[PDB]
Amino acid sequence: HHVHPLPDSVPESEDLFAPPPRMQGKEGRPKPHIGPNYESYVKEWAKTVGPNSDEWWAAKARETLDWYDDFKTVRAGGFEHGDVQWFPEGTLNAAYNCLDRHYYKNPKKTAIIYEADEPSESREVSYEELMQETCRVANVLKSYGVKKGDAVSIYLPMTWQAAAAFLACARIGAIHSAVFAGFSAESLRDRVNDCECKVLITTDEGRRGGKTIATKQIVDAALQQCPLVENVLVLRRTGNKVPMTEGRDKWWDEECAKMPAYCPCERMASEDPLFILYTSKPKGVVHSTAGYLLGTALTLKYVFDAHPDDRFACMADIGWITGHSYIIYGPLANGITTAVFESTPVYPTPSRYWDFVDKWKATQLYTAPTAIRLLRRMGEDHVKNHDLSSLRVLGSVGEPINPEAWHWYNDFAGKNQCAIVDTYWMTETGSISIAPLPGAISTKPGSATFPFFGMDVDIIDPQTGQVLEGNDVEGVLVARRPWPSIARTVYRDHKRYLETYMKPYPGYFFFGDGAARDYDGYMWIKGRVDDVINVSGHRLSTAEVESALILHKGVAETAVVGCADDLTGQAVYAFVTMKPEFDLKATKEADLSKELAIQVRKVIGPFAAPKKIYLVSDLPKTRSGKIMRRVLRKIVAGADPQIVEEVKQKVT
Ligand SMILES: C=CCOP(=O)(O)OC[C@H]1O[C@@H](n2cnc3c(N)ncnc32)[C@H](O)[C@@H]1O
Numbered sequence: 001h002h003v004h005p006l007p008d009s010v011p012e013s014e015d016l017f018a019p020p021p022r023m024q025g026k027e028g029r030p031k032p033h034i035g036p037n038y039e040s041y042v043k044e045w046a047k048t049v050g051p052n053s054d055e056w057w058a059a060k061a062r063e064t065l066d067w068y069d070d071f072k073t074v075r076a077g078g079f080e081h082g083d084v085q086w087f088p089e090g091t092l093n094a095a096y097n098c099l100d101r102h103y104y105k106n107p108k109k110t111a112i113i114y115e116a117d118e119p120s121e122s123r124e125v126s127y128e129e130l131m132q133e134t135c136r137v138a139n140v141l142k143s144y145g146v147k148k149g150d151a152v153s154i155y156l157p158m159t160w161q162a163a164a165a166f167l168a169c170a171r172i173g174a175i176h177s178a179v180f181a182g183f184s185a186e187s188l189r190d191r192v193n194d195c196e197c198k199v200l201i202t203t204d205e206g207r208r209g210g211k212t213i214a215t216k217q218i219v220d221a222a223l224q225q226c227p228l229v230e231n232v233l234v235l236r237r238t239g240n241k242v243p244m245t246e247g248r249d250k251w252w253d254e255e256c257a258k259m260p261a262y263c264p265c266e267r268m269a270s271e272d273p274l275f276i277l278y279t280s281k282p283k284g285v286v287h288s289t290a291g292y293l294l295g296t297a298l299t300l301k302y303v304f305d306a307h308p309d310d311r312f313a314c315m316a317d318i319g320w321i322t323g324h325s326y327i328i329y330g331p332l333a334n335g336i337t338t339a340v341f342e343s344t345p346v347y348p349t350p351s352r353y354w355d356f357v358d359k360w361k362a363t364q365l366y367t368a369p370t371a372i373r374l375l376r377r378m379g380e381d382h383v384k385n386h387d388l389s390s391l392r393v394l395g396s397v398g399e400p401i402n403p404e405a406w407h408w409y410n411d412f413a414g415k416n417q418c419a420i421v422d423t424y425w426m427t428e429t430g431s432i433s434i435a436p437l438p439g440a441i442s443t444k445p446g447s448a449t450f451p452f453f454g455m456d457v458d459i460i461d462p463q464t465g466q467v468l469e470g471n472d473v474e475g476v477l478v479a480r481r482p483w484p485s486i487a488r489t490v491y492r493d494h495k496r497y498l499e500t501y502m503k504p505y506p507g508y509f510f511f512g513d514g515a516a517r518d519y520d521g522y523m524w525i526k527g528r529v530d531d532v533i534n535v536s537g538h539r540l541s542t543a544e545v546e547s548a549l550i551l552h553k554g555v556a557e558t559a560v561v562g563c564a565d566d567l568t569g570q571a572v573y574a575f576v577t578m579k580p581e582f583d584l585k586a587t588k589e590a591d592l593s594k595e596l597a598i599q600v601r602k603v604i605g606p607f608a609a610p611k612k613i614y615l616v617s618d619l620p621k622t623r624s625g626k627i628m629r630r631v632l633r634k635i636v637a638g639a640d641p642q643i644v645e646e647v648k649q650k651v652t
Contacts, residue, residue, distance in 0.1 A: 001472055001518065001519050002472045002473070002474070003472050003473070003474055003516045003517070003518040003519065003524070004518075004544075005403070005444060005445070005446065005447065005518065005524065006400070006402065006403050006445065006446035006447075006524065006543055006544060006547040007403070007544065007547045007548035007551055007603040007604065008403035008404070008407075008445050008446070008547070008551070009403075009404070009551055010403070010407070010445070015403075015444060015445060016442050016443070016444060017410070017419075017420070017442060017443045017444075018442040019032070019035065019036065019419055019438060019439050019440065019441070019442065020416070020417050020418065020419065021417065022391075022392045022417050022418060022419075023035075023305065023392060023393070023418075023419050023438050023439045024036065024439070029392060030305070030307040031439075032305045032437075032438065032439020032440065033301065033302055033305055033439065034302060034305075034437045034439055034440045035437075035439035035440045036439065036440060037440055038440065038441060038442070038450075040440050041437050041440045041441060041450065044453070045450070045451070045452075045453060048453040048454050049453075049454065049455070049456040049481070050456070053454070054074040054075065057074055057075070057454070057484070058071075058074050060294065060298060061074075061087055061090075061290070061294055064294055064297045064298060064333070065092055065097050065290065065293060065294060065297070065333075066092065066096060066097055066101055067090050067091065067092050068091045068092055068093065068267045069089070069090055069091040069267070070089075070090055071087035071088065071089045071090030071270065071290075072089040072090075073085070073087070073088055073089060074086070074087065075482070075484075076088065077482065078481075078482065079482065079501070079502040079507070079508065079509055080502065080506075081498070082488070082489060082494055082497055082498055082502065084291075084482045084486055084488055085270075085271060086270060086271070086288070086290060086291040086294075086482075086484045087270040087290045087291070088269070088270055088271055089270075090269075090270045090290060091267045091268060091269055091270065092267075092268060092270070092289065092290060092293075093170070093171065093265040093266060093267065093268050093289075094167065094170035094171075094268070094274060094289055094293055094329065095134060095138075095167045095168070095170050095171035095265055096171075096265045097293060097333055098167060098328070098329060098332035098333050099111075099127060099130060099131040099134060099167060099332070100131065100265070101335075102127050102332070102335040103127045103128055103131045105335070106127070107126065107127055107128035108126050108127075108128060109126060109127055109335075109337070110124040110125065110126055110127075110311075110337045111125055111126060111127040111129075111130045111163075111332060111337065111338065112124070112125040112130060112160045112163060112337070112338055112339070112340050113125075113311065113313070113337060113338070113339045113340070113360050114159070114160035114340050114342070115339060115340065115341045115342060115343065115356055115360075116159075116207075116342050116343075117207040117208060117209070117210065117342045117343045117347070118207075119348075119352075119355065119359075122359075125160050130160075130163065130164060132261040132262075133161060133164040133256070134163075134164040134167045134168050134171060134263075135168075135171070135259075135260065135261055135262045135263035136256035136259045136260070136261060136263075137164055137165060137168035137201075137233075137252075137256060138168040138169075138171045138172050138263040139259035139260060139263050140233065140255045140256060140259055141168060141169070141172060141174065141199060142172055142263075143255075143259070144198075144199055144230075144231045145198075146169075146172060146174050146198075146199055147172075147173075147174075148172065148173030148174065148266055148268075148272075149173065149174070149175065149272075149273075150174045150175065150197070150198065150199075151174070151175045151176075151177055151195040151196060151197035151198075151276060152169050152174050152175070152176050152177065152197050152199045152200070152201065153176075153177045153178075153179065153188075153191065153192045153195060153197045153199070153200045153201070153229075154166065154169075154176050154177065154178040154179065154200075154201045154202075155178075155179050155181060155183075155188060155200065155201065155202040155203075155215060155218075155219060156178070156181055156201060156202060156203055156215075156235065156318070157181035157182075157203055157206030157207070157208065157213055157215065157237065157342065158181070158206075158208070158317055158318065158340055158341060158342040159203065159206075159235070159237055159340070159342060160340045161235055161252070162178075162318050162340070163318075163327075163328050163332070163340065165201050166178065166275075166318070166324075166328055166329075167328070167332075168263075169275070170268075170274055170275075170289075171263055171265055171266065172263070172266050173266035173268050173272065175195070175273050175274070175275055175276055175286075176275045176276075177191065177192075177195040177197060177275065177276040177277070177278065177284070178275070178277065178318055178319055178324070179191050179192075179278065179319060180317065180319030180320070180623045181202075181203070181206045181213055181215055181317075181319065182206070182208075182213055182623060183218075183319075183623075184218065185218045185219070185221035185222035186222070188218060188219065188222040189222040189223075189225050189226060190281075190282050191278045191282055191284075192222060192223070192226045192228075192229060193225075193226055193228075194278070194281075194282055194284055194491065194492075195276050195278075195284060195491060196228055197228065197229065198228050198229060198230050198231065199229070199230070199231045199232075199233070200219065200223070200226075200229050200231070200232045200233070201232075201233045201235070202215050202216060202219050202232065202233070202234060202235070203215045203216065203234065203235045203236075203237040203238075204216045204234055204235070204236060204237055204238055204239070204240060204242040205237055205238040205240055205242065206237065206238075207237065207238060207342065208342065208343060208344060208347075209343060209344040209346075209347040210347055210348070212238070212240075214242075216234060216242040216243065216244075217242065217243070219232065220243055220245070223248075229248075230248065231248065231250070232245070232248050232249045232250070233250060233251075233252055233255060234249055234250070234251055234252060235251075235252040235253075236251060236252060236253055268289045269289070270288060270289060270290035270291065271288045271289070271290070271291075271488070272288065272289050273286050273287065273288060273289075273488070274287050274288060274289045274292055274293070275287055275324065276491050277321055277324060277427055279427055280622055280623075280624075283490055283493075283496065283500075284490055284491035284492075284493075285321075285427050285428055285487045285490060285491075286487060286488050286489045286490065286491050287430055287485070287487055287488065288488050290484075291430070291483075291484035291485050291486070292329070292430045292431070292484075292485045293329060293333060294484050294485070295430050295431035295454070295483065295484045295485025296325045296326070296329045296330035296333060296430070296431050296485065297329075297330060297333040297334055298431075298453060299325075299326075299330065299431040299432040299435075299452060300312070300325075300326060300330035300331055300333070300334055301334055302437055302452070302453070303395075303421055303423060303432050303435045303437065303438070303452065304364045304366070304393050304395065304421065304438070305392065305393060305437075305438050305439050306331070306334055306336055306364070307336075308335065308336060309336070310336050310337070310363040310364065311336070311337040311338075311339070311360055311361060311362050311363050311364075311390075312326070312331045312336055312337065312338050312339065312362075312363065312364050312366070313338075313339040313341070313356070313357070313360070313362035313363075313364060313365045313366065314326040314327045314331075314338070314339060314341075314365075314366040314367075314395075315339070315341045315345070315353065315365065315366065315367040315371070316366070316367065316368070316397070316624070317623065317624070318340075319623065319624075320623070320624045321426075321427040321430075322366075322368075322397055322398070322624070325430065325431055326366060327339070327340065330431070339356075339360070339362065341356070345367070345371045345374055345375055346374065346375070346378065349382060350374075350375055350378035350379075350382040351382035351383065351386075353365070353367075353371075353375065353383075353413075354382065354383050354386040354388060354413075355386075357386070357388050357390065357391060358386055358387050358388060358390075361390035362390060362391060363390055363391060363392055363393075364391065364392065364393045364394070364395065365391060365393075365394050365395065365413070366394075366395035366397065366423075367395070367396070367397070368396070368397055368398035368399070368624065368625035369396055369398060369399050369400070369401040369402070369405055369625065370398065370399070370557075370621060370625035370626075370627070371625065372396065372401065372405045372408065372409050373402075373405050373550075373556060373557050375408075376404075376405055376408045376556075377556040377557075377579050377580065378580075380412055383412045383413065384412060388413065388414070388415060389415075389417075391413075391414060391418050392418055392419070392438070393418055393419050393421060393438045394409055394410075394413055394414050394418045394419070394420050394421070395420075395421045395422075395423055396409065396420065396421070396422050396423065397423045397424075397425075398624055398625045398626060399625065399626060399627065400446060400525055400526065400527060400542075400543035400546075400547075401422055401445075401446055402446065402543075402546060402547040402550045403445030403446045403547055404547065404550045404551060405550070406420060406422075406445035406446055407445060410445075419436070419438030419439070419443065420443050420445075421435050421436055421438055421443075422435060422436070422443075422446065422447060422448045422449070423435040423448070424448040424513075424523075424525050426511060426512075427487070428486070428487040428501065429483070429485060429486060429487070429511075430483075430484075430485025430486060430487065431452075431485040432452055433451060433452060433455050433457075433479075433483075433511075434448040434449065434450065434451045434452065434455065434457070434523050434525070435448055435449065435450075435452055436448070436449035436450065437450075444522055446524070446543070446547065447518075447522045447523065447524050448523050448524075448525055449522055449523060450521070450522070450523065451523070454483040454484060455479060455483055456479065456480045456481055457477055457478065457479050457480070457515075457523070458477075458478055458479075458480055458508070459473050459474065459475045459476070459477065459515055459516070459517055460475050460476055460478050460505060460508070461475050461476075462475055462476045462529070465505055468517075470517075471517055471518065471519050471520070471521055472517070472518060472519045473516065473517055474514070474515065474516030474517070474524075474526075475514070475515065475516075476505075476510070476511075476512075476513070476514055476515065476529055477511045477513050477514070477515035477523075477525070478505055478508035478509060478510055478511065479508055479509040479511070480507075480508060482509075486509070512528060512529055512530070513525050513526070513527065513528060513529060514526040514527055514528075514529055514532060514539075514541050524543075525543070526541030526542070526543045526544060527541045527542035527543045528542070528629070530630070531561065531562075531629050531633075532562075533560070533561070533562035533570050533571075533572055534562070534569050534570045535565075535568050535569065535570055535571065535572065535607045535608065536567075536568040536569060536607060537569075538605075538607050538608075540560075540572065540604075540607075540608050542559070542560055542561075542629065544604055544608070545558075545560045545572065545574070545600060545604065545608055545610075546558045546559065546560060548599055548600045548603045548604055548608075549574060549576060549596055549599065549600065551599060551603070552595060552596055552599045554578050554579050554581065554582040555576060555577075555578060555579070555596075556577045556578055556579045557576075557577040557618075557619055557627075558574060558575065558576050558577065559574070559575045559619050559627045559629055559632055560572055560573065560574045560575070560610065560629075561573055561575075561629050561632045561633035561636055562633060563633070563636045563637055564637070565611065568607075571610075571611040571612075572608060572609070572610045572611060573610060573611065573612050573613075573614070573632075573636050574596070574610040574612070574613045574614065575613075575614050575616050575619060575632055575647070576593075576596065576613055576614065576615055576616070577615075577616055577617065577618060577619060578592075578615065584615070589615060592615075593610075593613035593615075596610070596613060597609045597610055597613070614647075614650050614651055615650070616643075616646060616647060616650055617643075617646060618640065618643045618646075619632075619643065620632065620639075620643050620644055620647065621639050621640075621643075622639060623639055631644065631647075632647065635647055635648055635651055636651060
């Protein structure tokens with residue numbers, strides 16, 4: 001075979017995992033929406049793509065969402081000029097479909113499981129309580145003069161009220177622009193200025209992993225260079241003394257106390273912007289209302305086989321698109337219970353995730369590979385002794401998942417009884433693009449499998465632009481047609497939007513990842529095209545090599561980048577993080593990096609061997625969990641910021 005799976009210790013003949021009994025409607029579990037085999041997936045998938053899919057999408061749009069005014073046209077526009085349209089004549093409100101209509105049905109039903117940084121301070125937040133706090137904040141925003149189309153910045157930590165902040169902006173037609181609680185004043189500054197918002201929401205302080213976040217302090221430093229900001233709503237999260245600017249800053253609780261607990265919904269056009277999300281100049285991705293909301297609802301319902309009574313647990317942060325889509329809009333659109341996790345995976349201990357699952361009986365869990373590798377690094381005592389039988393599905397998101405981690409996830413977290421869904425997508429896709437449907441697809445470690453409804457992808461040659469037709473091919477991934485949840489522009493920078501995604505390969509959407517469709521049709525996302533290494537003509541993906549390195553005993557996490565090599569063009573350079581146990585004194589470093597080079601030669605090839613390996617305590621990662629390989633590539637070429645100092649030193 002030309003295309004090989006990500007290196008794994010299990011033989012390929014014993015590495016295919018059919019949907020287990022919890023996803024077969026047995027043991028009293030819900031029957032999956034799509035099942036039981038790959039055929040049942042294509043039968044429905046094929047309805048959602050091609051020129052004959054309008055009828056299907058028109059129905060799902062009316063099945064999934066409540067509409068103030070119905071739509072006439074289903075889709076229009078294209079990539080060329082960035083004029084994507086979906087249900088343009090229709091109107092709705094995001095807050096209504098995430099709150100009101102569910103409050104009217106079961107008001108005492110839990111909407112949010114607020115898992116506070118301290119486990120004892122956790123509680124349930126019903127829809128009634130959530131809708132009421134949302135309407136109060138909306139009325140506060142309206143009292144500040146916020147109008148439909150105005151941008152509002154949200155600098156909130158993972159407290160449950162962040163959902164109220166989001167939905168309050170969408171209730172009145174404003175455009176919220178959420179920023180990671182923890183970002184520096186300079187990063188916050190640039191994002192508050194680009195969106196030109198006049199209102200800012202934040203807390204006095206944040207709490208994560210037992211460490212405080214001086215949100216109001218960082219905000220004060222930022223707003224010194226944000227002239228437009230006139231009003232700041234400050235939430236009392238810790239109650240510790242923080243500076244408050246007279247006139248500009250008002251307390252959340254005191255402002256909401258003056259307002260009613262209901263607020264009418266603004267009638268939004270399908271294509272009115274819902275939010276701006278800036279990606280780490282700053283790129284403010286913009287999403288519309290109807291299309292983004294429909295994509296998050298359908299993906300959640302089908303990719304996680306969500307049912308009315310489930311308790312979905314996405315452990316991401318709302319500063320990330322993963323939180324936007326699968327903490328707030330997605331789950332609450334479907335009217336179920338969702339989790340707001342304020343802590344880390346290892347506070348107070350590396351058992352927190354599992355203490356959480358058994359406490360609330362999470363029916364699905366959804367986190368990043370960087371966290372799965374973290375818990376793997378901490379031993380199996382923290383997880384082995386839990387029940388966790390309430391789970392049915394386990395999700396990975398943010399990067400390629402090494403089969404080694406995929407197995408640990410499958411073994412201990414799911415006790416080999418849960419489906420593993422490797423969900424591939426981007427901030428610019430709005431919702432999950434390629435992922436296995438858990439009740440129908442048999443999984444391969446590290447493979448996203450097949451594309452989701454509305455997504456028709458192709459493998460194109462990166463230079464010629466020709467479609468590699470069929471199986472056992474590899475290249476760069478691209479989409480053939482728009483999908484409902486696709487981003488519509490970059491805020492006040494539609495040229496960057498077209499030049500980044502639409503002009504590289506005229507006719508398609510350009511994700512920026514390498515991909516391979518193996519002999520069975522499974523898709524394999526190998527990493528960022530920018531991270532590809534060209535060793536004497538061979539194109540090495542970062543997932544291939546990293547997955548191989550983590551196959552050696554004691555390896556915790558790895559990151560490989562490229563650098564100029566006179567003989568080979570580029571050479572591979574590896575940054576390796578070893579587990580706590582591994583005694584770096586007893587074992588010669590030279591002998592270790594030599595065993596690793598061999599490990600790569602044996603499974604990949606004699607060209608993928610690193611020309612140099614660096615041992616480091618950690619890796620440069622973003623808040624979401626992405627490994628910042630561009631940094632490592634820049635260094636070799638000459639979150640926790642203190643990790644860059646160790647790299648510049650260990651490399652030099
Ligand atoms: C997850 C959504 C939000 O991610 P965002 O911050 O927009 O970054 C998107 C990128 O994450 C990678 N990526 C994400 N999921 C996967 C995945 N499942 N496998 C491999 N790479 C992945 C892949 O490079 C993609 O372009």
